[PDB]
């Protein structure tokens, strides 16, 4: 009954991030310039500052 779709659906969450006017920006950081990057992170999935739609993001991914 579970596998056939009984009480099955999709659950949604949202991420709303804001900027500081002309200080901050959206983009992929680089290791050799930016400071105190989060340990055990994954910055390679970013495309122009945002992860592309349709990819699977897991724990530790930026």
């Amino acid at each position: 009954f579970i596998d056939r779709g009984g009480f099955a659906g999709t659950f949604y969450r949202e991420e709303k991030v804001e900027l500081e006017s002309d200080i901050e920006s959206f983009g992929k950081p680089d290791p050799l310039i930016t400071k105190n990057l989060k340990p055990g992170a994954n910055y390679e999935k970013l495309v122009d500052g945002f992860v592309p739609v349709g990819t699977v993001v897991k724990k530790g991914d930026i």
Binding site: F1, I2, D3, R4, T10, V53
Partner: protein, 357 residues
Amino acid sequence: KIFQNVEIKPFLIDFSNLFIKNAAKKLFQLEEQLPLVPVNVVMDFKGISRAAVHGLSRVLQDEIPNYMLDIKPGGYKIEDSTDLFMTEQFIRNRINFIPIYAKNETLVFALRSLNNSCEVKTIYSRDLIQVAGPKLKYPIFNPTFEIGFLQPGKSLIIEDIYIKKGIGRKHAAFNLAVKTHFSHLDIEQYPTDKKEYMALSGYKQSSMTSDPRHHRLGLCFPAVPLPHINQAVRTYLKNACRIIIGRIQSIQKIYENFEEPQPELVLFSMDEEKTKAIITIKDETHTIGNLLKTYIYEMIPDISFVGYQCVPHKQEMVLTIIHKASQEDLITLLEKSIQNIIQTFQILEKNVDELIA
């Protein structure tokens, strides 16, 4: 002759009903039977334990290999699928549970639906175009399924729809047979219409005491071609037999290696000349354990103990056998019981081949 008196009956659409006739004829231009129909098969077994019949039923339900239609990762084309309601999860759940009767694992389909109209357009299963593999001389699924629906001006493009193999226990989309009947023909029954007996099961013997050996089992298969029903059902039955034998033969490779230290077999020598054998097998169900317990109990009427405990949260079957013989004699009796199981299912194979013409 363990298995006799089998009868097979398909599930067909009654076109004498005007409503169904008109609806089918104006929806799918359908005036005769669908290529694939469900088939109800009723089987009578005599001189066989209910453990074996129930194990055969369980294997035919969700322990036999079976084929479904699945979408490869990246098949759902986000670049082209503009529909906001037909999500990948919903559509792939719809596709996985379409009953198919496939010939090989090479067929690859595709679903390309474009909605150029101003009304919601329903995507049926007849819109699945075979794009890879040999061309089909007969459909493998019915064209009357409702895969989805598109809002006006939307689209749904899915590629790499392949055939995936698995057992029904792991995922329900591989389930094969749906139960329709199970009864014991050698036990009398009360008339349960009376208010005196409606609180009881009906049988005149308690399950704590009864040992029926004459059963009727009726199972329904969801998709079988019309002109080869007897060819399909028979195959299914035969398939089940091999599976059980195969699994039993696995245990037959354990007892043969009782001299060497084997993780799945543990032998103790208890007090009062008593010996103990523990067989722990991972990813086994109540089928093999129940068969083993029943046949060991039949082989050794005066056994001290036997149990087949299958634990849900441990995903394993532990068969404990305590008997007042030596280790060698116990292993000999276990091998004899396994051989009895093998010959019983071989006789089932032969009867299946003999009955269904």
